[PDB]
Amino acid sequence: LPTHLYKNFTVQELALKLKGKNQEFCLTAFMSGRSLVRACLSDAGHEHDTWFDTMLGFAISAYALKSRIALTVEDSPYPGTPGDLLELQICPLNGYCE
Amino acid sequence: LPTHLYKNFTVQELALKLKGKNQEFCLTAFMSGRSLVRACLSDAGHEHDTWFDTMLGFAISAYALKSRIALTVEDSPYPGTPGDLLELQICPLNGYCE
Amino acid sequence: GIVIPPKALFTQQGGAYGRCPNGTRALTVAELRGNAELQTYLRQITPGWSIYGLYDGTYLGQAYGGIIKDAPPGAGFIYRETFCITTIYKTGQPAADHYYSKVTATRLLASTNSRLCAVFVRDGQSVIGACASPYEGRYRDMYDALRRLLYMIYMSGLAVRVHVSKEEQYYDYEDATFQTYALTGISLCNPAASIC
Amino acid sequence: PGIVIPPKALFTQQGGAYGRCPNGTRALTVAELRGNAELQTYLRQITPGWSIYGLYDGTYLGQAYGGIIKDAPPGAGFIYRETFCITTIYKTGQPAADHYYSKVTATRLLASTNSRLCAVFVRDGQSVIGACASPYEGRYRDMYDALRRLLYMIYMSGLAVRVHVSKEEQYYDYEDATFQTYALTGISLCNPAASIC
Amino acid sequence: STPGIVIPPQEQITQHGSPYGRCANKTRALTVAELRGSGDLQEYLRHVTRGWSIFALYDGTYLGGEYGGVIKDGTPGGAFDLKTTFCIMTTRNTGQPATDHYYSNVTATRLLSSTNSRLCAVFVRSGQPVIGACTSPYDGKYWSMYSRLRKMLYLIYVAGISVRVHVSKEEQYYDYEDATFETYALTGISICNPGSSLC
Amino acid sequence: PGIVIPPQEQITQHGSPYGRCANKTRALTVAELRGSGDLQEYLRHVTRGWSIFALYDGTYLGGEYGGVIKDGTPGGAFDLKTTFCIMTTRNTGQPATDHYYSNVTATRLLSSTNSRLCAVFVRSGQPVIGACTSPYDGKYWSMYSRLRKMLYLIYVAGISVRVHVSKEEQYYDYEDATFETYALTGISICNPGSSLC
Amino acid sequence: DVPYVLVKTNMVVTSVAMKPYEVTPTRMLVCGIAAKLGAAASSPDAHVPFCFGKDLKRPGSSPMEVMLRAVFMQQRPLRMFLGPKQLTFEGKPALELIRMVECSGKQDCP
Amino acid sequence: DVPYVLVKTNMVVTSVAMKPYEVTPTRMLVCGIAAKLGAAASSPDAHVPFCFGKDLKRPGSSPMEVMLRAVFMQQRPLRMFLGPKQLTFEGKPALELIRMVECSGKQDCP
Amino acid sequence: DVPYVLVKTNMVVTSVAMKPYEVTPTRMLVCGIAAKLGAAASSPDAHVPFCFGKDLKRPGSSPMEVMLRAVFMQQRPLRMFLGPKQLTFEGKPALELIRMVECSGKQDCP
Amino acid sequence: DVPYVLVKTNMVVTSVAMKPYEVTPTRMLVCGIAAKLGAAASSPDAHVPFCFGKDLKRPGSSPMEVMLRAVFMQQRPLRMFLGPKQLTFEGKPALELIRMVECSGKQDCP
Amino acid sequence: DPPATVYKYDSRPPEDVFQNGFTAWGNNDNVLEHLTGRSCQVGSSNSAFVSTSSSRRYTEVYLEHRMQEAVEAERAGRGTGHFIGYIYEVRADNNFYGAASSYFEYVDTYGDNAGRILAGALATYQSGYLAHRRIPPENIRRVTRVYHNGITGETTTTEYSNARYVSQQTRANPNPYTSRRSVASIVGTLVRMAPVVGACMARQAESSAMVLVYYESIAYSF
Amino acid sequence: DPPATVYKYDSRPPEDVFQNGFTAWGNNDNVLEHLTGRSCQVGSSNSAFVSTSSSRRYTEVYLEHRMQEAVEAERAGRGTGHFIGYIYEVRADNNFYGAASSYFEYVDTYGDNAGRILAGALATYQSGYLAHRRIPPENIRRVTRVYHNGITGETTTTEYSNARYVSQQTRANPNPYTSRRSVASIVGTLVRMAPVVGACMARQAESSEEAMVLVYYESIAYSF
């Protein structure tokens, strides 16, 4: 369950696909000279929560705005697999998160 | 019940009307030096017969052809009332009955 | 060449003194002479010294040697038995529609409790014969209507396209050089509307 | 020049605690209270002696002081226990007839917890009318999810529209408003060729 | 359009209209002039019609519902492509007595016929309609008279014979569109001399 | 170039009046009928009388006419009594395997009453594949609310993507299509050679 | 009655008539006068009275009625099959017309 | 069939016909050709084929049959209500005549 | 209503709208104005009013709503299937949009 | 928790965020950073963290979410009603945004 | 091809015809009015045409029936039984126009409602040819005199040639006769019955009342 | 009535503008390409127009938000917090054409599918006026220099008049600017966010004395 915080990265990739039975949206956060941060959100199980739809809309908005972002990523129980996106922040437009 | 045979008369009048409940057709036979011969035929007892329809069609044909006719009229039990038409003959076209 | 009525049409019990029963008419000498099969049947059924009547002749018995002798119309009607043929024949042909264009209705035929017939002519030559009756046939219900149009075209002389069914062949016209079938329809010629 | 006065009946019985007016209500203003003679009369009979009440842009002194409406900067009077709140929704009882305003632009947004999304429709730099929509209450509450998408777009683009309202419900969300506020029923983007605006 | 025409009463309209501009047998399409001349029908239609629905009339249209009830001019069958056509029943039992009504020196003109319904003629005098009279084998009190009347009517029509026509006012017919004459049940035709007892 | 012919089982059992094919169905075209021997033979077998039927851009003279297909105009024969309609959905029976198409842009949108949102994915100005999404029907109905957001974004901004489809359901929404159309299962805005693609 | 069926050729229907049938009320008689073309006025063939039965129970016109009307209107020469039965017409006997065929030419009608 | 009822004005019946009805044996077809006055010979309105049903179970002439014979004989201009149903006449389609009214003048027949 | 479905090609959505549905309270109308490219300003095709239903019981945006927003923003020529039903928009009638497809070229939008 | 509701004027939403709600799983937090226009970087009003609850059981966007997105995109000055309740955002406390109204001018926003 | 020879039945003897010829009743050259028989009625005879037939059989048939009528009249005690009929053999020229051809041209010019179906049917059946205004004695070639004694049934057929006849290689006009639209009221086609013969054909042969009926009223049975 | 006075926000000081004026990037006089911002992109800047606004409030609002960005950058440790913005008061003549007027004329000439709804919405909202090729120093009347210290929150506003200015009774062109149909591929209307400002209006003010983030207006106009 260890979570990691990332600041002033940009959304380079955004994908919405099927991962077996469940639906999954994944994003790639980029910062010059840093390794890419891959964070996913899955609708597993999932109980009636707008959480998946709300976070997807916010991630699309962050991609469409070409703005810098701040994100909290919980480590995946499986190594190599991208982490779970818990929090997402759109940094000041034309600016940076402090 | 006395019947009279008239020869070489022409159909001057032809009428089809209702006589109370029953349907009736009447004709007027004309000859220059003679009095008009009025004869009528009724559907009265011919509700299951085709007698009325056959005779009417023949009288219309005799009128349409403008030909001379021969007719057997049975006297009416009431004076002044037209007689009963029993027989009708269309004389030779452009000619006379002998 | 005249139309020969098939052997099967020959009435088993012929007409009494020229009065062929309703639906039958007196056989002719030319029709009997043209049917070899009927002449063969006639020799086996006709007894010794018997003389039979025909429309335009007489038939002599087997003691004479089966002689078909000519006579004027109705002369042979003086004898007890007259040779009659059933005017209706079930051909067994398909019920398909057959038509003849630019034909005029002429030469009418009518007999007691039977058919109203007409001969359809083109360029002074007989093309086909057509009959209708309210008493018998497949198209018997159509008679009441067809007779009204047939009367009109006969009266006017208007060129028509006659429609027939070869399902029933008629032998009402004696010594006919034309085939006679059941009347199914009449259509007045209209060259502008592609009719005749 | 003249501001909209909220009717006496809207005054919340148990007001907001330290500026926190309950959901569906907002703090009453000095200009709105000064414009309502009937509310001032009610206030004098309910207010006990030596009691101080809060307003959005002021304070109200008790009956012992003589019912004084004293001005203050926004939220200064929120330091006191009881704040004067007014219910933002009013059932006018007017006919449900359609009322429209042509060549108007959506400006000055308003939003509150478990209550309406409002906009001020402007023409030639002047406020024409106010229109609100909510998924929580009102007759046209089912229409909110759709109307908010078009309202957001016209607000973002600044596109001139014909705004449709129902005067069946009057809203008092905007404090000291020089415009009337009603329920949003429809929006139609101006098309002069199609006889719209 | 033209006033003074016979207006079929409100009870003649069918409960439901007709598709393909094909009014059911024993019924015909209502006209512009008939609807315009009928306050009863106009009020009935305004009451029952809903939406932006345009209905077909014989020679025009009826813009009902949200349109207000506007009657527009057209052409014969020019709006039969519409979903619904307004139809009126041609038969009406008047309740009037079986008394004899006659019209002298009349000629049969302008014939009318339709599927499973009456044969009609317009009886005229001095080039103007006097009365309309109809005969049918399918319906009416005088159905048995048809086979007889049709022979007399055909004869007088083709030869242009001046007659005395007899009608029964027990049944009124609305077969003719925009009729400047009333139409009743034909009961007799008389080819007679003036003042004759045969008339 | 050749067009996709909807198989015989797509034709509805009864035609449609007013040129209004029922929801989830659309009008059969001239080119589709001409390219289908199965439909032409089916129609010759079931059609009777001197009946002329409407197609999207022409007519089918059936019954006693022989089965003649005549050219027309879009909806030019919708005034006829019966219009030939084909069902847009077809359960292929094919496995749920992932099928993808790289460097494609969403173009030529399609939508209809109670049915699906469709797009034509192109590369080098030529159609590659058609993909559809819907909340009303199909195995992937739950994906619609999500896929519509991605599709709207990539469509308006003209974003080159890798599209994912399921061949379990084939659609015939597009008339005279020079491409096959399947169920949309994924949209990826990714870098070349990425695991996210 | 007459002993056998008579075949009269080149006959034109000069007059037509309708009258009731004495023995049967459900039937009537369609009568007429036939005349041989070119025959002498004194000859009996110049005036041949004929009748045929009509069923009043059956509606419509029989084939004989239809032909009679047409041949009378157009004065067409016929081959008439008359007798053996004799019916009453104008108080005098009239031969029963059982069959009639229109003349085609000199061959069938000499 | 045709989608809706056609109203053809100033039509003169040029030809009449009779034929059997294919689908029903207890009924027949009374057919004909109608022509619009003043119309071009090339125009389809110059020869409009039409048909109407006749009940063979019922004896006599129907109102449509009686009118047809009269208007054909006298060449009277008509208002014909044709369709939507199409029947077969001379191997080609013909519109069903459901109603016909004789022309009064230029008002009803323009 | 209009008798049959109209197919209007090369149509650009010039304006969009939202309004309630009079007959059903559980539904609403998504309306707009479409204009034919190259058409005269006087022509009725230069400002075609249209509407389509939206279920208020169901949350989210329907396929027709999503396409309308995209094609309106990008001014894309369309092939619209309008009618037969007519709805009310700005007090005047508007054809029901049942289906819409974006134009590919001259072949599907002439 | 702060003792009373704060009214901050001429505030611009500089950053927006989304995070889960610790005490309730059926709810989430829509957070952000508000800054007073022209205020000194050292001043506490230059950095005002705020949060508001969002019901995850209800589908769609709440009036506060819709306004927040619009006022953040367009950098519109606001009158923010913050507190008394305090929520967690980026490990630090954030005032609860209960109401927000856009600035009309210098009168309402001095 | 148009016929070079036309025939005409008449009661007039050759001593009158071979010297005078055939002259029309008036100057009414209306095609419909003649073919309807309206311009050939008693007290309305103003027709500009002389009725002839290209078919000799048609004129022979009419003579045959007029002969039978004389026998019928004798049996009715209205005549002697004696009959004399004449069939004139006439050479046709460009003054002779086809009756059927002239009728169909009139209908093609003034519309279908301007004619009568039976008027056209009759013109074709009669094989009629209309000679305008006059048939000169130079055109009449031969005559067939048919005498009949109704009492004995003896028929005497004698041929007579015309000395005034001019031999020419002329035939009937190949083009139809054209006239203005009829303004007169025409009810139907007037015909003489037994057999059906046109009013003009029958009345012109008659010489010192004839029963004329509308063909339309008898074409269909009642 | 056309405006006699137009305003322009810029980073360039008056000792530069009052002597050099404003010169357009190139000779691309295409109306649509400028209003969609295509002719104002980095490495694609060839527009023949100089963006100005008839509304001073619009230029004031943009300056105010550019000032707030400098404060935001300081808080993020990416700048000093200091900001200097200039609002130039320019006298308009027949060389100044209405942006909205020029756009709607282009759409009326080449059809609805030849334009973008948001490009027209933006031009109206910006109250834009396009000066063709150059704004000479003789037209530039005054300047409002706005200095801000992000650390103290002190705002200094100083006015400066131009000596090279020539006074005339002229106003903007009442007729729209007309150009040929755009053959270039235009996806959407390029805008700078927070607040939404046209690409040309924002890029022309920017001067090097971190690349500008431009997005399509169409992709953000509706919420996701």
mmCIF file with all atom_site columns, N, CA and C in Angstrom, chain L residues 4-5 89-93 136-142 162-171:
data_model
loop_
_atom_site.group_PDB
_atom_site.id
_atom_site.type_symbol
_atom_site.label_atom_id
_atom_site.label_alt_id
_atom_site.label_comp_id
_atom_site.label_asym_id
_atom_site.label_entity_id
_atom_site.label_seq_id
_atom_site.pdbx_PDB_ins_code
_atom_site.Cartn_x
_atom_site.Cartn_y
_atom_site.Cartn_z
_atom_site.occupancy
_atom_site.B_iso_or_equiv
_atom_site.pdbx_formal_charge
_atom_site.auth_seq_id
_atom_site.auth_comp_id
_atom_site.auth_asym_id
_atom_site.auth_atom_id
_atom_site.pdbx_PDB_model_num
ATOM 1  N N  . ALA L 1 4   ? -12.696 55.282 -32.873 1.00 0.00 ? 4   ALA L N  1
ATOM 2  C CA . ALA L 1 4   ? -11.568 56.154 -33.191 1.00 0.00 ? 4   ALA L CA 1
ATOM 3  C C  . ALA L 1 4   ? -10.339 55.718 -32.396 1.00 0.00 ? 4   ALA L C  1
ATOM 4  N N  . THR L 1 5   ? -10.563 55.012 -31.271 1.00 0.00 ? 5   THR L N  1
ATOM 5  C CA . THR L 1 5   ? -9.507  54.550 -30.379 1.00 0.00 ? 5   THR L CA 1
ATOM 6  C C  . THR L 1 5   ? -9.575  53.041 -30.113 1.00 0.00 ? 5   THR L C  1
ATOM 7  N N  . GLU L 1 89  ? -2.589  53.023 -26.083 1.00 0.00 ? 89  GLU L N  1
ATOM 8  C CA . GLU L 1 89  ? -3.768  53.711 -26.594 1.00 0.00 ? 89  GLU L CA 1
ATOM 9  C C  . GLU L 1 89  ? -3.428  54.116 -28.031 1.00 0.00 ? 89  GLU L C  1
ATOM 10 N N  . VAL L 1 90  ? -4.078  53.467 -29.009 1.00 0.00 ? 90  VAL L N  1
ATOM 11 C CA . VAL L 1 90  ? -3.825  53.679 -30.438 1.00 0.00 ? 90  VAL L CA 1
ATOM 12 C C  . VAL L 1 90  ? -5.030  54.331 -31.130 1.00 0.00 ? 90  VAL L C  1
ATOM 13 N N  . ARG L 1 91  ? -4.769  55.342 -31.980 1.00 0.00 ? 91  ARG L N  1
ATOM 14 C CA . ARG L 1 91  ? -5.799  56.012 -32.772 1.00 0.00 ? 91  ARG L CA 1
ATOM 15 C C  . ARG L 1 91  ? -5.994  55.169 -34.036 1.00 0.00 ? 91  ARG L C  1
ATOM 16 N N  . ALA L 1 92  ? -7.232  54.716 -34.272 1.00 0.00 ? 92  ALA L N  1
ATOM 17 C CA . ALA L 1 92  ? -7.583  53.878 -35.418 1.00 0.00 ? 92  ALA L CA 1
ATOM 18 C C  . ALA L 1 92  ? -7.897  54.688 -36.674 1.00 0.00 ? 92  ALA L C  1
ATOM 19 N N  . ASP L 1 93  ? -7.514  54.149 -37.842 1.00 0.00 ? 93  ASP L N  1
ATOM 20 C CA . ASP L 1 93  ? -7.763  54.728 -39.165 1.00 0.00 ? 93  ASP L CA 1
ATOM 21 C C  . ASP L 1 93  ? -8.340  53.655 -40.126 1.00 0.00 ? 93  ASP L C  1
ATOM 22 N N  . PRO L 1 136 ? 1.973   52.563 -37.463 1.00 0.00 ? 136 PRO L N  1
ATOM 23 C CA . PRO L 1 136 ? 3.116   53.481 -37.330 1.00 0.00 ? 136 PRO L CA 1
ATOM 24 C C  . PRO L 1 136 ? 3.132   54.229 -35.989 1.00 0.00 ? 136 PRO L C  1
ATOM 25 N N  . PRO L 1 137 ? 4.315   54.702 -35.502 1.00 0.00 ? 137 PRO L N  1
ATOM 26 C CA . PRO L 1 137 ? 4.362   55.428 -34.209 1.00 0.00 ? 137 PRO L CA 1
ATOM 27 C C  . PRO L 1 137 ? 3.443   56.643 -34.098 1.00 0.00 ? 137 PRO L C  1
ATOM 28 N N  . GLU L 1 138 ? 3.118   57.273 -35.248 1.00 0.00 ? 138 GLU L N  1
ATOM 29 C CA . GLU L 1 138 ? 2.248   58.451 -35.376 1.00 0.00 ? 138 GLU L CA 1
ATOM 30 C C  . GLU L 1 138 ? 0.817   58.187 -34.890 1.00 0.00 ? 138 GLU L C  1
ATOM 31 N N  . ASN L 1 139 ? 0.401   56.903 -34.824 1.00 0.00 ? 139 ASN L N  1
ATOM 32 C CA . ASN L 1 139 ? -0.934  56.500 -34.369 1.00 0.00 ? 139 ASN L CA 1
ATOM 33 C C  . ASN L 1 139 ? -0.986  56.220 -32.865 1.00 0.00 ? 139 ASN L C  1
ATOM 34 N N  . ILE L 1 140 ? 0.153   55.816 -32.272 1.00 0.00 ? 140 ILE L N  1
ATOM 35 C CA . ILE L 1 140 ? 0.247   55.480 -30.850 1.00 0.00 ? 140 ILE L CA 1
ATOM 36 C C  . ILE L 1 140 ? 0.272   56.761 -30.019 1.00 0.00 ? 140 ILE L C  1
ATOM 37 N N  . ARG L 1 141 ? -0.832  57.015 -29.303 1.00 0.00 ? 141 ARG L N  1
ATOM 38 C CA . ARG L 1 141 ? -1.074  58.200 -28.488 1.00 0.00 ? 141 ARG L CA 1
ATOM 39 C C  . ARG L 1 141 ? -0.453  58.141 -27.087 1.00 0.00 ? 141 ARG L C  1
ATOM 40 N N  . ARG L 1 142 ? -0.885  57.167 -26.269 1.00 0.00 ? 142 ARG L N  1
ATOM 41 C CA . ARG L 1 142 ? -0.495  57.030 -24.866 1.00 0.00 ? 142 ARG L CA 1
ATOM 42 C C  . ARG L 1 142 ? -0.193  55.577 -24.479 1.00 0.00 ? 142 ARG L C  1
ATOM 43 N N  . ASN L 1 162 ? 3.202   59.980 -26.043 1.00 0.00 ? 162 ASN L N  1
ATOM 44 C CA . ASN L 1 162 ? 4.128   59.852 -27.172 1.00 0.00 ? 162 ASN L CA 1
ATOM 45 C C  . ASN L 1 162 ? 4.329   61.190 -27.887 1.00 0.00 ? 162 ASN L C  1
ATOM 46 N N  . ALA L 1 163 ? 5.599   61.581 -28.080 1.00 0.00 ? 163 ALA L N  1
ATOM 47 C CA . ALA L 1 163 ? 5.979   62.828 -28.751 1.00 0.00 ? 163 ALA L CA 1
ATOM 48 C C  . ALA L 1 163 ? 5.818   62.709 -30.262 1.00 0.00 ? 163 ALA L C  1
ATOM 49 N N  . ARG L 1 164 ? 5.982   61.486 -30.796 1.00 0.00 ? 164 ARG L N  1
ATOM 50 C CA . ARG L 1 164 ? 5.880   61.192 -32.226 1.00 0.00 ? 164 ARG L CA 1
ATOM 51 C C  . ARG L 1 164 ? 4.429   61.081 -32.730 1.00 0.00 ? 164 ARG L C  1
ATOM 52 N N  . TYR L 1 165 ? 3.440   61.122 -31.811 1.00 0.00 ? 165 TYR L N  1
ATOM 53 C CA . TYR L 1 165 ? 2.010   61.031 -32.121 1.00 0.00 ? 165 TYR L CA 1
ATOM 54 C C  . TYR L 1 165 ? 1.494   62.223 -32.923 1.00 0.00 ? 165 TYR L C  1
ATOM 55 N N  . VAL L 1 166 ? 0.686   61.932 -33.958 1.00 0.00 ? 166 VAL L N  1
ATOM 56 C CA . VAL L 1 166 ? 0.048   62.908 -34.846 1.00 0.00 ? 166 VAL L CA 1
ATOM 57 C C  . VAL L 1 166 ? -1.469  62.794 -34.643 1.00 0.00 ? 166 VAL L C  1
ATOM 58 N N  . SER L 1 167 ? -2.121  63.909 -34.286 1.00 0.00 ? 167 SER L N  1
ATOM 59 C CA . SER L 1 167 ? -3.560  63.952 -34.043 1.00 0.00 ? 167 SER L CA 1
ATOM 60 C C  . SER L 1 167 ? -4.340  64.138 -35.342 1.00 0.00 ? 167 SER L C  1
ATOM 61 N N  . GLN L 1 168 ? -5.368  63.287 -35.550 1.00 0.00 ? 168 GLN L N  1
ATOM 62 C CA . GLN L 1 168 ? -6.270  63.289 -36.713 1.00 0.00 ? 168 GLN L CA 1
ATOM 63 C C  . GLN L 1 168 ? -7.692  62.951 -36.247 1.00 0.00 ? 168 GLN L C  1
ATOM 64 N N  . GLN L 1 169 ? -8.713  63.365 -37.023 1.00 0.00 ? 169 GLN L N  1
ATOM 65 C CA . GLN L 1 169 ? -10.122 63.089 -36.716 1.00 0.00 ? 169 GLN L CA 1
ATOM 66 C C  . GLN L 1 169 ? -10.597 61.802 -37.427 1.00 0.00 ? 169 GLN L C  1
ATOM 67 N N  . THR L 1 170 ? -9.712  60.782 -37.467 1.00 0.00 ? 170 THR L N  1
ATOM 68 C CA . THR L 1 170 ? -9.945  59.491 -38.121 1.00 0.00 ? 170 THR L CA 1
ATOM 69 C C  . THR L 1 170 ? -10.483 58.425 -37.171 1.00 0.00 ? 170 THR L C  1
ATOM 70 N N  . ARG L 1 171 ? -11.164 57.422 -37.746 1.00 0.00 ? 171 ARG L N  1
ATOM 71 C CA . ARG L 1 171 ? -11.717 56.256 -37.053 1.00 0.00 ? 171 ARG L CA 1
ATOM 72 C C  . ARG L 1 171 ? -11.498 54.981 -37.878 1.00 0.00 ? 171 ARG L C  1
#
